[PDB]
Amino acid sequence: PYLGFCPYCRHSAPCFSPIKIENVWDESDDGSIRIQVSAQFGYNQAGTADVTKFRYMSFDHDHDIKEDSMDKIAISTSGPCRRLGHKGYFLLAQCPPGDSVTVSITSGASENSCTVEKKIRRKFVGREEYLFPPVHGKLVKCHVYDHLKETSAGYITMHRPGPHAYKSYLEEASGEVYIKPPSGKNVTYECKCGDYSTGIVSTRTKMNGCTKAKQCIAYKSDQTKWVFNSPDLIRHTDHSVQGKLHIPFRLT
Amino acid sequence: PPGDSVTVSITSGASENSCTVEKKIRRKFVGREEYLFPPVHGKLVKCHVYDH
Amino acid sequence: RFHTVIPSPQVKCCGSLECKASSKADYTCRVFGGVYPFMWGGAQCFCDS
Amino acid sequence: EVQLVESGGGLAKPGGSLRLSCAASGFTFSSYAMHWVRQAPGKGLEWVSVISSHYSTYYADSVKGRFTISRDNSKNTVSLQVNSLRAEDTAVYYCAKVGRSGYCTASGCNALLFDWFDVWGPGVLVTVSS
Amino acid sequence: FEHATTVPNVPGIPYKALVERAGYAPLNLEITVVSSELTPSTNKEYVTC
Amino acid sequence: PTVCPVPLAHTPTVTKWFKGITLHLTATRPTLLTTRKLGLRADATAEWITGTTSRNFSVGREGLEYVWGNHEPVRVWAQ
Amino acid sequence: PGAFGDIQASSLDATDIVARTDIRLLKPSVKNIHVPYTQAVSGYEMWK
Amino acid sequence: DVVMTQSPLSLPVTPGQPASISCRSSQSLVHSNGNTSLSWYQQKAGHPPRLLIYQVSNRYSGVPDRFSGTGAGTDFTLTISRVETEDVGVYYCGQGAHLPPAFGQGTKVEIK
Amino acid sequence: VNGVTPGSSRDLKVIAGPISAAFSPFDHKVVIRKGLVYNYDFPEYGAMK
Amino acid sequence: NNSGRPLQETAPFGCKIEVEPLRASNCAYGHIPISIDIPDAAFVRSSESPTILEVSCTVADCIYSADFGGSLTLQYKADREGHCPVHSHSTTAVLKEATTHVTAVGSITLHFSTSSPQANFIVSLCGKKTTCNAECKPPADHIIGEPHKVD
């Protein structure tokens, strides 16, 4: 459930959301649209399949994995879009024509949206334009994204998450830098405060020679998860391919 | 969003009171190239925006 | 249509990095100096220079 | 002041086991690789094992499968569990702190591989006899 | 000593000459038009909007 | 007044010949190209392009100047 | 770059993909971490 | 494993005169930084070894100036310029640039 | 550059000009808008149309 | 709506229009008659400049381009080690160096830019002259992003 840097959040500015889009496909002859966001869908808190809810990233310095329901996600390009299906990392929906696509979660009054530009154009199949597939007509060859959840258009590669620094972990007191890990989590830290230094602290620990809070970094070793090869994360030292997951909704 | 007229509406329950007036509001941009949104990466140029 | 995949970036943010040579299609790599990049804390580095 | 106290040694039987502890003070304990070294009576010392600040554990060849070094940074200690005791394990064991844990170059800054041991504890005697 | 010449009005270009006095050692003389500013005198008629 | 972020268009590709240039341009959106000669006569032209195209421009000894989108002006001088 | 066959491979699954798309990365400018780059359009689409 | 050899095994000395201890490695001990990981320690009877020299020429703080370290490659020497009575004890060279760390067998320095 | 006004640097005196050919990119009357300049023949003051 | 293109792209001679005050900056046109009263202390008595006994000029490969596309070498025999000023006495060739350290004997290589297909000009070092004679080829490139340093 990584969170990354959307170019357009709710208000005006680029900022970090769990539901950034990064890429979009629009080649299905029906106009069905497949979207990839950093969030997940159809999985419960531990990751086990549960259609009615989804899990995503937390806006806190503990930065755990939080959850919500399907009834409060919305897709819209020019008007609201009708969701057709969802599978973990991926969404698919029908959208009206427009210039950009927006995914929005409405956790009550907590609105978090990402928008990305994509000139989606009403397309058709045949030698004549038409608004809708007519009741009567010839049956010709077309290609539409398969609504089935368990299809596969390909695979995407996932890797161990890299370092993810924080500042609540760090603190400045009387010109000395201390670390404040959360409860029971072995948090690795490093810096040069003069000479270089590294280790892991699970409790509030002091640092020597450290005069400024900006001098050091601390973060917990969360190797129990795999993250997409997103361009808005600093990867781990070893970026070996460690997981592949299917790209649902194969263009059948 | 871009449009041809602006509408203000009060929804006092079912008591609906709205006013609409024409104004050709056109999506405008700054620079020497049109764009849908301010991109994440780019040059920083002079503008004038209404102060929030 | 090519899909342009951009791997996750890397920082050796007070050492030195070199762009190696890969075998990917139209592979491109480059190195930058002082960047001091922020992601969600507001600092991911020591030695801002 | 930097200080290392060793404890847990004494008399033991061959084939037995014992846990040694080294409590440290006067410096950032989590920031350094901790070493266990040994010197049995009348011989030179003998490096036994090291645990990095990243919990990376290396051992001498003679101590494989029997000695396990561990560490807790919260209470500032490094421990050595010893199993399958034998006669030549009889020695004074010294808990040792490197003055420097690594150095930095243009390719980055590196871990455990050291240049010198700056601090030694008083050491604790282990005597394996029948 | 006085020496006269006519440089070309081109910003940033070096122009070189050798002033040769009657008996003294010849002296190099190089000129760059580092910047130029053609400014007229203007009067404010009015504003409009 | 304040600052805005504005995109930087694709840098064109110069394809060259005897006293002049052929700029190959790509721009997903209407982007303005403006050029002018560096002699007595400006002969300046400005135009908006979409898609991908190419433009031939004669360059004299006095030189030619072009501005592509928000990129800074670029100067040239023929041989 | 920018023309048909800008990316080529012996097969869809072939791992010896060769392309020349005139991708050039740009120096990051904004304080936040990200990668800027510019590139020619997909000449497959241009031919289409 | 790096083999470290010291010589002489016994070095009777006289107070007031110089003395030297020679040290050979089976391998080079230079790092990528160019610093060489050789260190000289003194051990007194009933006491843990105390660092004298690190980075063959650099003297540790509080060490008397009469101690000095020289050498390069695999050949190194510790020189006492003016022996004192407290200088008796067992002197060891050790290395840390190669795993496992290796130390010289040691030289006993005693007053003639 | 007028042939009259001298420039001085502490020992060096110099006199420039006048230009070989006079020039001005500005016509008689101009318009200023947000740093942009136009050679527009605006109506004179009081002659609104 | 119908303002048209402002002067920042229309002013000829490629010179940049700026406001407060209104002006045009870096505007290349015409020539400046300039006359300088050089201080006498700048000059040095010629008894001190290192009198070169002989010089021979050999022009290397040269190309008449806007840049310093030509080079040459002067083989010199002089009497003393000094700082000879070097100059080109043609209006169609300009050097890159102005003064060069000079030994009692040696050779110095120089760089220059010219517009003529034939480089048949005069060079002075510590005053004294030599003809540099050679053929300059047409420029291989069709440009340089740099103004022609010579007419």
Side-chain angles (χ1 to χ4, degrees), chain C residues 1 3 5-6 8-12 14-16 18 21-22 25-27 30 34-35 37-38 40-44 46:
Chain C
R1 313 162 39 68
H3 171 222
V5 64
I6 297 89
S8 296
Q10 284 70 229
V11 294
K12 175 51 70 170
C14 57
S16 170
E18 61 76 14
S22 173
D26 199 353
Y27 185 74
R30 184 169 321 310
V35 55
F38 301 175
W40 183 230
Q44 302 306 292
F46 63 94

Side-chain angles (χ1 to χ4, degrees), chain F residues 16-19 32 34-42 44 46 48 59 61 65 75-79, chain J residues 5 8-16 64-66 115 139 141-148 150-151:
Chain F
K16 297 190 43 50
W17 38 265
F18 195 58
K19 308 150 182 166
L32 183 63
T34 66
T35 195
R36 58 150 154 168
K37 284 162 211 53
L38 290 63
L40 160 71
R41 54 181 291 91
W48 295 89
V59 177
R61 148 68 65 79
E65 164 161 290
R75 329 188 84 99
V76 287
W77 290 268
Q79 296 294 324
Chain J
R5 305 316 319 185
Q8 284 86 13
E9 301 145 30
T10 300
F13 294 123
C15 60
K16 177 204 89 55
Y64 58 105
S65 62
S115 173
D141 191 359
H142 300 276
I143 208 69
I144 193 66
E146 157 184 317
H148 280 258
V150 54
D151 185 74

Side-chain angles (χ1 to χ4, degrees), chain D residues 52-116:
Chain D
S52 78
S53 60
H54 271 246
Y55 301 97
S56 303
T57 81
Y58 283 42
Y59 304 81
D61 189 358
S62 58
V63 293
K64 296 293 191 291
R66 300 177 306 111
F67 286 71
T68 61
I69 190 171
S70 62
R71 184 207 290 202
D72 197 333
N73 313 99
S74 65
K75 84 202 71 163
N76 295 337
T77 185
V78 60
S79 302
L80 186 66
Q81 179 66 44
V82 186
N83 298 307
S84 299
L85 289 166
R86 93 201 172 281
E88 59 265 19
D89 294 325
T90 294
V92 62
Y93 284 161
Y94 274 110
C95 178
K97 181 204 167 284
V98 298
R100 187 73 189 83
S101 54
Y103 53 78
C104 203
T105 187
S107 58
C109 314
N110 56 8
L112 186 149
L113 284 180
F114 63 95
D115 293 337
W116 67 85

Side-chain angles (χ1 to χ4, degrees), chain A residues 16 27 167 215 230 235, chain C residues 1 8 10 39 41 44 46:
Chain A
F16 283 81
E27 281 156 10
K167 303 179 40 59
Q215 295 297 110
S230 159
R235 72 171 154 219
Chain C
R1 313 162 39 68
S8 296
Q10 284 70 229
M39 182 179 72
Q44 302 306 292
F46 63 94

Side-chain angles (χ1 to χ4, degrees), chain F residues 7-77:
Chain F
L8 269 72
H10 201 58
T11 300
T13 292
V14 300
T15 300
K16 297 190 43 50
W17 38 265
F18 195 58
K19 308 150 182 166
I21 62 170
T22 294
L23 300 195
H24 298 262
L25 281 290
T26 65
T28 57
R29 210 61 45 67
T31 303
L32 183 63
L33 180 53
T34 66
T35 195
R36 58 150 154 168
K37 284 162 211 53
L38 290 63
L40 160 71
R41 54 181 291 91
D43 189 359
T45 182
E47 67 159 339
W48 295 89
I49 47 168
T50 71
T52 72
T53 184
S54 298
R55 298 299 191 258
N56 292 354
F57 291 112
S58 68
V59 177
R61 148 68 65 79
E62 71 305 349
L64 183 63
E65 164 161 290
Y66 67 91
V67 183
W68 168 234
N70 291 339
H71 294 282
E72 287 290 4
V74 175
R75 329 188 84 99
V76 287
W77 290 268

Side-chain angles (χ1 to χ4, degrees), chain H residues 36-58:
Chain H
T36 300
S37 291
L38 276 297
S39 60
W40 282 126
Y41 309 81
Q42 179 188 225
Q43 186 174 39
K44 295 301 302 222
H47 290 356
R50 204 291 301 280
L51 183 63
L52 295 175
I53 301 299
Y54 61 96
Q55 194 178 193
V56 298
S57 61
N58 295 112

Side-chain angles (χ1 to χ4, degrees), chain E residues 9 29 38 40 45-46, chain I residues 23-25 42-43 45:
Chain E
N9 187 2
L29 183 66
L38 183 73
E45 287 288 357
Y46 49 84
Chain I
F23 181 77
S24 178
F42 56 79
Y45 182 83

